[PDB]
Design a protein around this ligand. Sequence first.
Ligand SMILES: CO[C@@H]1O[C@H](CO)[C@H](O)[C@@H](O[C@]2(C(=O)O)C[C@H](O)[C@@H](NC(=O)CO)[C@@H]([C@@H](O)[C@@H](O)CO)O2)[C@H]1O
Ligand code: NA
Ligand code: NA
Length: 204
Amino acid sequence: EAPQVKSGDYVVYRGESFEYYAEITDNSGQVNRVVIRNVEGGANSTYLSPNWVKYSTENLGRPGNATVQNPLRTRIFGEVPLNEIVNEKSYYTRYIVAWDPSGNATQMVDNANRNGLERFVLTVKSQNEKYDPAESSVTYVNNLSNLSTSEREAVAAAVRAANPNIPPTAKITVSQNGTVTITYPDKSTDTIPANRVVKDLQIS
Ligand SMILES: CO[C@@H]1O[C@H](CO)[C@H](O)[C@@H](O[C@]2(C(=O)O)C[C@H](O)[C@@H](NC(=O)CO)[C@@H]([C@@H](O)[C@@H](O)CO)O2)[C@H]1O
Ligand code: NA
Ligand code: NA
């Protein structure tokens, strides 16, 4: 038997670092090598793209480094560039191959039913998708159809205060009717409708 791998659903986001760990076990208790690779290229290939996907495995080549009770772990990490293309097909299916002391290597099987095992999908999303802006602030304005500059600034400050985890260099803008736009570093956006963040007292 070859080393067995447990990975996951590895979603990553433009403009952001990522880090995941896969777990690897072997019936011998030992794994000597781990490669993460594209499917193409035959048994000797180590080619992996995109080039910003990195990985590392500590504690290779030691007895008992890959047991059920303490699996070997491989870090899969990197920084997603702002210039990545994002769409419904902007994923990359990759394979984790580990070798035991007898040279048995994890088999690459091209089937989505192996995803989360030795096969995994790296999905690149736009930066906005990492964030779920809180809509729990409320700013009272004079007239919801015509916010002043000071009122627009107050709405933006309230949204920022409720959203400390949004990237500090994301830009929060508010329109004359209170609509909020959060523009992330990769230039994707989230919107918040005005009536979730702004009210007036015009209605008796
Ligand atoms: C032998 O054929 C390969 O089998 C694999 C499984 O073994 C994969 O199924 C398969 O397709 C995908 C994939 O999921 O990786 C579909 C993605 O939509 C697509 N990504 C983009 O286009 C990004 O914009 C594409 C590739 O361009 C990347 O992987 C580049 O290396 O590959 C196929 O080519
Ligand atoms: Na084995
Ligand atoms: Na979002």
